[PDB]
Amino acid sequence: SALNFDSPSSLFESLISPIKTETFFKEFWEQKPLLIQRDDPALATYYGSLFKLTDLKSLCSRGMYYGRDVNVCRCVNGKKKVLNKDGKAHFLQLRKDFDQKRATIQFHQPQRFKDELWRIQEKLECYFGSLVGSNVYITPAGSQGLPPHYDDVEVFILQLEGEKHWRLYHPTVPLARECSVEAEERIGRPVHEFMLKPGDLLYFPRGTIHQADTPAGLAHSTHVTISTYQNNSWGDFLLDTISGLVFDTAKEDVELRTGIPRQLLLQVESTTVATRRLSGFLRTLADRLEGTKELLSSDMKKDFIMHRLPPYSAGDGAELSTPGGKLPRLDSVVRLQFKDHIVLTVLPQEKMVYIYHSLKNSRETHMMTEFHGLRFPLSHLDALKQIWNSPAISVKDLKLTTDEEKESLVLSLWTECLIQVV
Amino acid sequence: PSALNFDSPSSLFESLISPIKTETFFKEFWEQKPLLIQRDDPALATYYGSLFKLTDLKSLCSRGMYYGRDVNVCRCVNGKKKVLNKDGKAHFLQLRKDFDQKRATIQFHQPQRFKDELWRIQEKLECYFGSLVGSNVYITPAGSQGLPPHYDDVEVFILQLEGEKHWRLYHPTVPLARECSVEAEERIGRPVHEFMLKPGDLLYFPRGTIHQADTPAGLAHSTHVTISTYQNNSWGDFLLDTISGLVFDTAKEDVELRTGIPRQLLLQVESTTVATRRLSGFLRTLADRLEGTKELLSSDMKKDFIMHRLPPYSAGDGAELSTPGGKLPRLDSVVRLQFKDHIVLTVLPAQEKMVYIYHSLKNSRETHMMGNEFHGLRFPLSHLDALKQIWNSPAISVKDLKLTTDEEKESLVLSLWTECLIQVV
Amino acid sequence: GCLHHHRI
Amino acid sequence: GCLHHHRIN
Ligand SMILES: O=C(O)CCC(=O)C(=O)O
Ligand SMILES: O=C(O)CCC(=O)C(=O)O
Ligand SMILES: [Mn+2]
Numbered sequence: 001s002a003l004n005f006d007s008p009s010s011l012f013e014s015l016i017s018p019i020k021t022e023t024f025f026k027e028f029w030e031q032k033p034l035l036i037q038r039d040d041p042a043l044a045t046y047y048g049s050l051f052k053l054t055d056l057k058s059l060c061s062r063g064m065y066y067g068r069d070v071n072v073c074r075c076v077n078g079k080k081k082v083l084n085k086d087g088k089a090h091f092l093q094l095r096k097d098f099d100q101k102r103a104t105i106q107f108h109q110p111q112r113f114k115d116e117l118w119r120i121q122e123k124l125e126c127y128f129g130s131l132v133g134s135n136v137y138i139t140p141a142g143s144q145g146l147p148p149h150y151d152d153v154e155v156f157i158l159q160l161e162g163e164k165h166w167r168l169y170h171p172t173v174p175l176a177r178e179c180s181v182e183a184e185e186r187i188g189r190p191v192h193e194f195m196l197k198p199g200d201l202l203y204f205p206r207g208t209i210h211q212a213d214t215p216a217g218l219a220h221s222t223h224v225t226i227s228t229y230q231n232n233s234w235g236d237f238l239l240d241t242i243s244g245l246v247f248d249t250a251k252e253d254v255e256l257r258t259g260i261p262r263q264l265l266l267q268v269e270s271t272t273v274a275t276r277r278l279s280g281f282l283r284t285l286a287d288r289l290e291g292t293k294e295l296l297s298s299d300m301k302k303d304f305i306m307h308r309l310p311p312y313s314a315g316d317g318a319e320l321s322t323p324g325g326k327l328p329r330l331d332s333v334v335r336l337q338f339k340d341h342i343v344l345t346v347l348p349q350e351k352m353v354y355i356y357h358s359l360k361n362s363r364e365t366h367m368m369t370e371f372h373g374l375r376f377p378l379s380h381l382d383a384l385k386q387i388w389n390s391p392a393i394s395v396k397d398l399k400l401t402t403d404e405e406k407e408s409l410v411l412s413l414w415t416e417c418l419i420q421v422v
Numbered sequence: 423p424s425a426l427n428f429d430s431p432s433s434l435f436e437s438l439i440s441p442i443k444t445e446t447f448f449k450e451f452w453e454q455k456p457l458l459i460q461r462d463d464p465a466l467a468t469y470y471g472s473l474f475k476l477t478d479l480k481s482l483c484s485r486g487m488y489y490g491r492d493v494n495v496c497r498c499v500n501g502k503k504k505v506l507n508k509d510g511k512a513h514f515l516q517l518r519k520d521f522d523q524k525r526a527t528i529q530f531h532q533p534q535r536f537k538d539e540l541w542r543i544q545e546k547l548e549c550y551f552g553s554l555v556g557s558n559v560y561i562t563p564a565g566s567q568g569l570p571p572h573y574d575d576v577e578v579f580i581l582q583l584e585g586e587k588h589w590r591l592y593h594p595t596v597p598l599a600r601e602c603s604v605e606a607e608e609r610i611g612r613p614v615h616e617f618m619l620k621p622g623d624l625l626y627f628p629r630g631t632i633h634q635a636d637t638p639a640g641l642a643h644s645t646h647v648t649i650s651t652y653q654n655n656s657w658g659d660f661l662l663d664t665i666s667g668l669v670f671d672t673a674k675e676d677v678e679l680r681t682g683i684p685r686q687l688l689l690q691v692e693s694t695t696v697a698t699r700r701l702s703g704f705l706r707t708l709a710d711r712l713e714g715t716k717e718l719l720s721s722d723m724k725k726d727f728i729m730h731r732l733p734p735y736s737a738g739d740g741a742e743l744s745t746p747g748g749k750l751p752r753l754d755s756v757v758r759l760q761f762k763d764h765i766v767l768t769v770l771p772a773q774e775k776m777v778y779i780y781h782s783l784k785n786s787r788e789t790h791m792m793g794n795e796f797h798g799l800r801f802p803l804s805h806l807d808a809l810k811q812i813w814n815s816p817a818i819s820v821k822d823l824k825l826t827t828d829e830e831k832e833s834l835v836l837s838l839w840t841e842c843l844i845q846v847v
Numbered sequence: 848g849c850l851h852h853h854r855i
Numbered sequence: 856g857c858l859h860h861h862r863i864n
């Protein structure tokens with residue numbers, strides 16, 4: 001049951017155990033909710049170490065701001081009443097609004113301070129290839145922090161402290177791309193109703209309408225909601241790809257650069273000629289796509305690599321800044337490192353291929369002309385593919401005209417701590 | 423007698439480029455090559471000279487002008503644009519000092535915010551082009567050059583207001599560019615055109631056209647205004663605008679574009695053939711859909727235009743632009759649409775789908791193009807054919823509207839009337 | 848405005 | 856970075 005941090009895959013596998021990943025993606029992922037109830041006292045203990053109400057004591061001493069780091073709320077009348085003060089958040093004030101006013105506390109991106117949640121979410125970003133944020137929700141006994149609603153992300157909920165009554169409803173907007181509160185009268189009857197206890201994990205796709213409340217008693221409820229896949233649909237990837245095609249058009253190709261007919265925006269009906277012209281561009285683009293594969297610019301790739309968490313580091317990020325071991329020579333064999341933290345793309349006298357990585361990304365700003373990378377001549381692309389796909393490859397086998405650029409290519413990647421001499 | 427014909431957007435543009443016919447302009451010049459119109463009309467020269475004067479800077483500065491935002495000062499040094507801007511408020515004496523002593527060029531932004539004639543001209547052009555129309559004024563002292571050779575991202579109409587200026591135009595290195603950039607003279611070749619502009623002359627060239635100018639030695643400075651339009655108004659922009667609408671407006675029936683991409687797709691070092699064929703399939707399906715129905719799609723371009731353009735030119739106050747006059751329309755009245763070129767129809771991303779009508783009658787002239795709450799009328803999609811009737815008719819009887827009930831006919835016209843969009847004849 | 852602040 | 860400022864940011 002213990003989380004295995006040997007790899008992204010092993011982590012996710014353990015995270016959902018005893019459920020197999022093959023089953024998760026074939027029947028649950030983006031389809032329906034998944035409740036994983038366990039009777040593992042050790043796991044329940046581990047979950048409790050992820051985050052607890054008292055951690056805010058140390059956190060607030062660091063200095064935590066309302067809105068930015070913490071939010072105080074409470075559900076009245078199907079709406080969320082905010083009890084936020086303007087400025088720094090003091091643990092005593094929060095405790096007051098919590099125990100006295102029965103308000104729910106919501107901490108934003110705890111991974112910025114908690115090393116375990118960082119280690120977890122970072123491995124998940126690698127596994128999914130998408131940003132992974134999280135919000136901590138602390139609700140006092142016999143109360144409810146939020147009204148029924150649904151979010152725009154895929155979520156993995158881990159019950160840290162106490163129990164909580166959950167009710168899930170059929171989605172009004174399947175796999176929604178936007179969040180929205182719903183009227184208690186328009187959601188119908190709960191499709192799923194259950195109690196989450198420490199050590200339990202709950203997954204449900206974006207669009208899933210839900211609402212939870214802490215049962216009467218003394219013990220409060222604490223859970224962390226780990227979310228991912230925001231704006232990561234085929235529609236998003238489609239627009240991303242088309243934008244790349246449209247704006248990365250050669251200097252000698254001007255059709256897409258010509259102007260639309262004058263007053264077209266003033267028309268009360270899509271002209272038949274403009275529609276025909278548009279359909280023509282789309283079909284052409286379609287053919288251009290399946291035709292000669294090539295690397296295209298992608299804002300989604302850039303957005304991901306620029307805002308994701310850097311590799312987990314027990315102590316100082318020494319291994320992330322200064323390369324180690326021996327320098328790669330033309331006779332040695334190398335293995336790429338931090339592979340899931342690297343992306344290859346192109347920019348909007350030869351063409352160049354760009355390599356970006358997140359080894360030097362800031363953990364403190366996670367989810368809260370300034371981002372450069374490594375430039376390489378397009379002629380090196382096939383060589384980069386060799387390294388990317390190989391478990392261990394010899395510098396000599398790189399597909400480059402000269403042996404100098406082979407030692408140059410590897411050295412360049414070694415200095416950034418991306419290559420290890422196997 | 424009147425230099426330009428302000429009867430309509432078309433008449434204004436026709437007179438602006440006279441004697442060149444609009445048909446010839448769009449068929450032979452627009453987005454293809456420069457058009458130089460050298461004249462020798464005393465009356466026109468005087469009219470142009472009234473559009474903006476170097477002397478107007480004193481009055482303009484007393485209204486509170488800022489460096490960067492409203493005015494820039496620069497000089498061309500070693501093929502690069504040197505900025506002489508100070509911080510904060512710009513004082514007339516500062517402008518004159520850099521102009522007289524440093525031989526700096528003065529660049530004033532969006533003079534139509536204060537100059538009434540430029541407002542009247544630019545508003546008419548926005549109607550004619552259906553695109554935002556801004557302008558910048560360039561004042562260069564004798565014997566100097568303010569900017570190095572370069573190209574801009576907009577279509578421009580240059581009016582020579584005061585003095586003369588020596589111009590050189592070059593073939594584009596990036597035809598119909600959608601970005602701007604300075605260019606090294608050692609890479610632009612020989613000028614395709616070289617000439618002298620004098621008061622009353624007009625010069626048009628497409629975005630991407632490389633150019634540079636300098637005021638000849640003497641005592642006369644040069645003043646011109648560059649009226650620009652069609653920024654980000656290409657087929658590529660419109661194509662993305664439409665696809666965005668087709669992808670993020672569709673109901674909850676076809677979740678296929680709403681489903682997530684495979685995991686780690688963004689970490690691949692090749693454009694996976696699996697996603698390639700899949701994307702091609704979507705594009706073809708979208709193309710068929712576009713030809714499959716004369717749908718009405720959401721358009722961010724339409725909204726950007728209507729919310730940032732100039733309001734109709736008003737001699738006095740905006741009376742007939744905010745306060746309905748005349749007589750209230752009735753089921754037996756004959757109505758006529760007003761300010762037609764200041765209105766757009768679209769849909770947003772209610773049981774039945776609605777159609778929204780937005781207009782720029784209340785837009786602010788003072789913040790035009792300065793890039794510094796916008797309500798419109800709403801009607802059920804079933805009223806579309808009736809709206810087309812009002813749009814495509816000089817005058818129409820309220821009772822002839824293609825609606826099932828008379829209450830709808832009256833209500834519709836009343837709603838439009840309240841926004842000063844209707845004239846009861 | 849989302850109730851779950853995935854990305855601030 | 857345009858020289859002519861069509862629309863002020
Ligand atoms: O427990 C609550 O108050 C609601 C939690 C929630 O909405 C979530 O985790 O997405
Ligand atoms: O007059 C100059 O120095 C250049 C003017 C210019 O670049 C323009 O009008 O776009
Ligand atoms: Mn939620």
Ligand SMILES: [Mn+2]
Pocket residue numbers: 572573574858859
């Ligand atoms: Mn220019």
